Structures are given as C-alpha cells and as structure tokens.
Design a protein around this ligand. Sequence first.
Ligand SMILES: O=C([O-])C(=O)[O-]
Ligand SMILES: O=C([O-])C(=O)[O-]
Ligand SMILES: [Mg+2]
Ligand SMILES: [Mg+2]
Ligand SMILES: [Mg+2]
Lengths: 269, 269
Amino acid sequence: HMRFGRIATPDGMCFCSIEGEGDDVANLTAREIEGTPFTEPKFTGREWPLKDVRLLAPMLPSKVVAIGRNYADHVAEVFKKSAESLPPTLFLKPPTAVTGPESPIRIPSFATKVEFEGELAVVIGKPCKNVKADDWKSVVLGFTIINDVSSRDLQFADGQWARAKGIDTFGPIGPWIETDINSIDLDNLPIKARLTHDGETQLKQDSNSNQMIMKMGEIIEFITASMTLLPGDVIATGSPAGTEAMVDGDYIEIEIPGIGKLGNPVVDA
Amino acid sequence: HMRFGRIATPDGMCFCSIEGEGDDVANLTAREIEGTPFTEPKFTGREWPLKDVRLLAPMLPSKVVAIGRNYADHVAEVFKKSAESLPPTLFLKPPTAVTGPESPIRIPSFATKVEFEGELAVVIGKPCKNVKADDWKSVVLGFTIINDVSSRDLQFADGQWARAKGIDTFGPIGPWIETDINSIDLDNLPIKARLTHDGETQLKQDSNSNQMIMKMGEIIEFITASMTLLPGDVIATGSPAGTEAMVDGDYIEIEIPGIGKLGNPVVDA
Ligand SMILES: O=C([O-])C(=O)[O-]
Ligand SMILES: O=C([O-])C(=O)[O-]
Ligand SMILES: [Mg+2]
Ligand SMILES: [Mg+2]
Ligand SMILES: [Mg+2]
C-alpha cells in the first residue's frame, strides 16, 4: 500500500518508499528498499528526508504504451474534429523520452507547438498477455502521472506521432507510484494541469478520468491482446482537454489528487 | 570483425561468435564469449554446433526505431500513391515484438493482411545523440536483418501504425550481427525475400539498399536529432517493394548477402 519512488543520492540510486503527509517534500521521507517494487518490500533501515535527495522517474519502463484520443473534448481541441471520426488509438513512447520530477523538458528548435498532456498512468506489476477487461486490476502495480509532451507541428507533418511524442525528455513520469489502487476511483478522479507562464500560473486542464472513452479494463484488454506487458511498463491512458503550447521558461504541473503532483521546467535544448 | 549471436544452449543463454562457412547452420559453430558484443571478446572455450542450439534474436534492444516509406516503389504498392506525397517517417516497434530465427510469427485472428517486410537493420554500438550524417559508422556495432511484419488492415484502420507493427513476434531479427561494416556496400547491397506458400517458394522482394530514399547517414542524423540511441538499439532502414500477405503455414525468408538469412514460420495464434 506504499508509494514507491526512485532516488539519487550523494551516493547512488535506489528504489524507495515515500512516507510522510500528503505531498510536500519538505514533509517527506524516503525509505530505502532492498530490491524492486515487484516483491514485498525489504527495507534497509536507511532513510533520507526527501528534500535531501533527488526524486527520479519511479521506473525505467521497458516500454511506454499510450492511448491517443481517449478524451472526446481533447480530440476536438487538437484535431478540430468530433471524436466519433477519430477513435482512440495505440501508440508508443520510447524509454528515452522518460524523465523525472523537476527535470527539464528540453525542446529542440525543430519541435514547434509543443504542448503538455497530463495523463493518468498505470504501472504494470506482472507479465501479462490476453488480459480480460474485468480482471484488469490483477496486473497493476500502481498509478502514477505522465506528461505526454507532444509537438503538434511534428504530429501533423510526420503522420506517425512517434517522433513528435518521442523526443528526449518528452515523457515526464512521477512523482511516485501509488500502490493503494483502491484509494483511486476511476469513475471519479480529477486530472488537472497548471501552467506557469511569464511568472503567472493558470489552470489549464481540469477534468476527470470519468471522461475516458476507453475505460481502464478495456485499455488493458486492448493492449494485451496485441502485446505482452512486463513489470515496470507504463500505460498512458490519455489526456483531457485544455492543453496548450509551452515555451522556454515555462513550468508545467500536472495534478492528480490521490497520487500527487508532477512538475517540470521547460527549456530550449 | 566477428559475427555476434545469441543462443539458448542445453546449458543456458549466452552471447557468442558465429564461426564457419556459409550462412547455413550445419556448417557453423557457436563460440561462447564471456561478456557481450560491446567489449573485447573473451572466449570461454565452450563451443557448439549451431544445429544443436537455438539461435535467438542477437540482441535485446531497448527500442527498435524504424524508418517507414523509405523505398519509393514500396510506398506505391502499399499506399497506392507516389512517394512524393508520403515521405519517410519515423516509427517505433516494441521490444516485445522482437523474435529470433526460426521462431514463429504468430498472427492473432484480429490481424489481417499481414505482410512481411525484409529490411536492412543497424545495431547501435555506443550511446549517442545529435550524430552528424557522415559520422554514422562511428556509432554502429554492426548490421543485421529485420522482418518488419505488418498488418496492413490494422495500419489503415488504426492510423498510428504501432499496433499493426507491434504485435508480439512481429519483429524477427537476425540471424546474427555482422560487425565487418566495411565489407558491406550500401551503394550496392541486394535485399531479397522468398515466401514459401503451399509448398512452393517464390522470390518476392528483390531490390537493393541503393534504392533507399533516406540514406544511412541521414537516417542516423534524423533519429539522433530527436532521440538518444543506446548500445543494442535497432534501427530498421525500410522495406523494398514486393511485399505480400502471409498466412498460417507459410515460411518467409529474408536474405541480405554479406549478412545471411532470416527465416521464420507463420502460424495462426
Ligand atoms: O493523442 C494523445 O496523445 C492523447 O489523446 O492523449
Ligand atoms: O513502412 C514501412 O515500415 C516501410 O516502408 O518499411
Ligand atoms: Mg515570451
Ligand atoms: Mg496523450
Ligand atoms: Mg518497415
């Protein structure tokens, strides 16, 4: 039922549990675990307070499998078409896209109209194939947040979204993995995003997972019909409406209550 | 200048050097190395006739990055449009699609008009980013073959090719990595594919890497401008014309002279 993370120390890296109230690192402690999150936790006895170390992406996924066009109004705002013509579709982000909390989103000069995309993410906890929708929870280790960073201009030019969504640092994940799955109600879970631009912060996405076109069980069944998923794999369940372009100097913060906050500065590469 | 393989032995799995005449297996010998293909090879002294062991995909890549629409006539046959309007484009195949020589291509019943795609592949030797086109050889471990298996029906219906190209087993690779890079002339390298159907074998693809729209250096530069590549990563350079659908019971065999042959049976899953 813990929250699992990865940290870097003046020493070296490790998995950890994160303990402390709500979510403000100054109030947070990281307790080293012996192995990986995939078996009952062997704690070392070592802890640092979170402020004293650096939170990383909580996992190094073999792959990042994403559902595109899973929120009707997001389809509308991005493609300027109603969702009926443009159904949810599977795509991949490379592991090299992955980055952690507070890490910069590094935009290359050829990547324009780059938007954030706050999304609920699911971390797989066991090898699985041909999973039935209603059995979905059986394969999930926990929930986390992803920012599915996307160059709109590349998406449109390229046709295949892969490059547009797969540039280095285009996949912030974190801040940790919430394994208390039943604390999270998919029929009622808010997804928010706040963009700081020119020193001023505004609410951009403000929706709920209950707006998903393809529901959680359906997603897992859909994916695993085609591909085997492994422990550590991440599934991005789609972005709600409200996304917009970012530039050097901005800061973007995704919030999912019950999980926490995922924040990143934005810079030119 | 060795040829590197991976094998499952009546012991375990290991990296090996492949020695002998031919690109035929009863004439060949697998020589165990202690480490991996990325450092200086140390032979353990264990050796096996290649016919007695199982040849695996020669690498477990972190990612497989593919250039689509890199052969003009292939664009024509597949999309029914001239290549001018549909330029080369980057996509990804999941590591779970990867399989080895002689291992079955397992077609799920929902995947139809599933075609082979023989392609030259490149295996990355060192970590790299922002590589310049004429510096490409510097980042390459060697060459292998890939079969970029693709459900044409899914490609069209889905829009994003990921699922269509990413189903488990849809990415045979091998039979080994040829490190003698300069023994291969990219201005003149035949690429062939022979399909066995109902007991008859026919030459289907019969082209040359000199038909590539984006050249090798350009490919590496294009990819690494966006994505860090790591040792072991595989780059699929595109398929020539001549591809067609396979069904249960077929056997498909890709040949790239100077490299060898990559053969796989096809079965209904
Ligand atoms: O297409 C997407 O990536 C989405 O809808 O989240
Ligand atoms: O589209 C592809 O994958 C290709 O052209 O090889
Ligand atoms: Mg400004
Ligand atoms: Mg998305
Ligand atoms: Mg291909």
